Design a protein around this ligand. Structure first.
Ligand SMILES: COc1ccc2c(c1OC)C(=O)O[C@@H]2[C@H]1c2c(cc3c(c2OC)OCO3)CCN1C
Ligand SMILES: COc1ccc2c(c1OC)C(=O)O[C@@H]2[C@H]1c2c(cc3c(c2OC)OCO3)CCN1C
Lengths: 182, 182
């Protein structure tokens, strides 16, 4: 099924990178390799769709825990940071794959913009405090990559030192905030 | 010699993480695991010695390129940033290996203290501008990991989009400077 292949592609891309074979992915999904291509016509297609599926999963937990009572930009961003830190901690495979898929040459401009416009409110809540350079078409991926690099580092230190996780998350957040916001 | 094991360790920890087995390291170097254990009594000893050797290779490349006439603290830091990014693009396995080793649990803090004190002038150069949080005993490793996560993203984008390399290095540097310095 389409769902069993996206899950195998998630784990494979997280462990082996974007160079994961489609022969490994369908095999790790219980279907033959031909079924993979009858759902995802090309390697690049599965790359782009899984990005859309992973970003949809990630933001749906971003906005799910977001307090709509909050109106201050920084406090609101602290909510989204804590949710993203928690999502990666609760879903280590999806976070690793969404990292390697956001980086890649293979993501088309249509998938990149649709990943932002899929949740328009959260986009404006996740972008309208940024350095304007990081919302440009040419540096938006890089801006997402600095954020995710800082978040991953925050995840690792926290899971490996739970007593201090509360401080890693706060320090990581302020560091991210000075790095990317205006 | 040991160099084959140290190099195999670099490639393997950069690929399969600190979780990489002693057997493949030894095997990808064409030496017996026993011999690996004849030179490194534990996997922990291997990981602490490797971190020392890898930090020495990186720090000396940093000081090999310094200009002793750069007396501005921020400009001097930008030179060191340029060196580190350059060192990471020329040796992506050594750089990828240094990030996982530095954030791992099994690295004794006598080891990483010895890593910073083998180049004391470099140590005080790159740490003189840092916030107190990131010079603390508890959050020093966290500061190095945030720096390295930002540099790694900078290297990844500069290598894959070289038409825009200069912007990534500059934006990466300024992002890092806001995140970690007073
Ligand atoms: C609604 O659509 C989106 C919003 C924001 C982002 C992406 C995105 O599309 C899927 C993306 O791919 O990456 C960022 C990045 C990010 C967030 C929140 C931020 C921030 C960020 O990095 C620029 O800067 C300060 O607040 C949320 C989590 N996400 C990893
Ligand atoms: C030799 O002595 C050292 C100096 C600086 C650092 C370490 C170190 O020991 C090996 C270290 O392990 O971590 C940092 C980190 C780092 C550098 C340069 C920086 C910086 C850094 O991290 C906070 O911030 C401001 O500029 C250089 C590279 N290195 C990865």
């Amino acid at each position: 099924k389409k769902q069993a292949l996206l899950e195998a592609a998630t784990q494979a891309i997280a462990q082996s990178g974007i160079a994961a074979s489609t022969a490994v992915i369908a095999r790790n999904a219980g279907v033959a390799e031909g079924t993979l291509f009858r759902y995802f016509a090309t390697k690049d297609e599965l790359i782009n769709t899984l990005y859309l599926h992973l970003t949809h999963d990630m933001c749906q937990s971003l906005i799910m825990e977001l307090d709509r009572s909050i109106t201050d930009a920084k406090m609101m961003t602290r909510f989204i940071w804590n949710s993203y830190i928690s999502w990666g901690l609760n879903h280590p495979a999806r976070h690793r794959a969404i990292r390697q898929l956001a980086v890649s040459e293979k993501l088309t401009k249509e998938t990149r913009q649709r990943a932002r416009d899929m949740f328009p409110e959260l986009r404006d809540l996740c972008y309208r405090s940024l350095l304007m350079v990081f919302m440009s078409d040419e540096y938006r991926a890089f801006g997402d990559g600095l954020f995710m690099a800082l978040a991953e580092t925050t995840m690792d230190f926290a899971a490996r030192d739970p007593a201090r996780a509360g401080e890693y998350i706060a320090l990581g957040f302020e560091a991210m905030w000075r790095a990317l916001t205006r």
